[PDB]
Design a binder for these strands. Structure first.
Ligand SMILES: [Mn+2]
Ligand SMILES: [Mn+2]
Ligand SMILES: [Zn+2]
Ligand SMILES: [Zn+2]
Ligand SMILES: [Zn+2]
Ligand SMILES: [Zn+2]
Lengths: 162, 162
DNA sequence: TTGACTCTCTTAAGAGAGTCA
DNA sequence: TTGACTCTCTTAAGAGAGTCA
């Protein structure tokens, strides 16, 4: 099995490579009518992506290193968390974008949490709009707002009460 | 079926049958430390479910009627909305449970909206905790809260900024 | 050992359609 | 005509593994 020192070396080579990705400045809603700035380190749109990186889906990538003649591979956003527990409350831990930008691999924009926690950040009002996430959001979720509901609760007769 | 009269007849037959489902009282968090009461009309756990109803999945049902000698079938929660547009902004409209109770078929607990709007209600703070849904939530979402994040954003070196 | 492709899978909110009696 | 089963599919946040040179 890979030693802790070997895992730290994978994390270090991953950081070295991702740190050379293009850095894109984005202005983002924080909630409460305030605006902030995030700096995303974005994997390229097409090959080559960077040393060790390859695309396995439209917005999916993997990181690969060969150690002592054995090929090891990880989801490209999971590498910062290789020294962390991989489940919690019986749920698998997932890499969760606080910047809501899939191509971004900035580890300061990622956290490690259940898929439900991950998804729920899409609707959070944001760090200045009432976020209650213990690991605080970096921005208001892209789907926060009144929604676009087509039809509300209704009945034709009188068979029901709320 | 095709005619407005035929569609109204489907909605009315559905309301009459669902109106005879057992009414189960559920006390729910509203947000803001307050609690409310919802009355769900719950489809039975096993056959028979009611005239026109059949189970196609662990928590999926369909409603079926024979019109003009032809069988017409719908998802069991979609029937209240048969006269509404079936898409919005190019996204499919879905039946969305405000009571977060799949077995419930109370149309006063249903709305008609995109799958994203639907999902997002799971994390809403609720009608007394800051819900901004234009079609208002009936309760705080079951997944609202601080979360259980295992690891937050972090780096080993000095290559990244927020 | 490495790059650039290929495939299918998970989850939890939702769907459509066929086989028998 | 009605009932009671069977199967796979959609979406958008996420995954693992194979082939070839
Ligand atoms: Mn996410
Ligand atoms: Mn729902
Ligand atoms: Zn980012
Ligand atoms: Zn938040
Ligand atoms: Zn209900
Ligand atoms: Zn709401």
């Amino acid at each position: 099995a890979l030693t802790n020192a070997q895992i730290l070396a994978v994390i270090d080579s991953w950081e070295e490579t991702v740190g050379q990705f293009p850095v894109i400045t984005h202005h983002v809603p924080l909630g409460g009518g305030l605006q902030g700035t995030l700096h995303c380190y974005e994997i390229p749109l097409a090959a080559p992506y960077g040393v060790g990186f390859a695309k396995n889906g439209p917005t999916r990538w993997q990181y690969k290193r060969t150690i002592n003649q054995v090929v090891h591979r990880w989801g490209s956003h999971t590498v910062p968390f290789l020294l962390e527990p991989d489940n919690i409350n019986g749920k698998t831990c997932t890499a969760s974008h606080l910047c809501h930008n899939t191509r971004c691999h900035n580890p300061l924009h990622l956290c490690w949490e259940s898929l439900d926690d991950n998804k729920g950040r899409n609707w959070c009002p944001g760090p200045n709009g009432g976020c209650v996430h213990a690991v605080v959001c970096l921005r208001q979720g892209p789907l926060y707002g009144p929604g676009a509901t087509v039809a509300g609760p209704q009945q034709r007769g009188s068979h029901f009460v709320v």
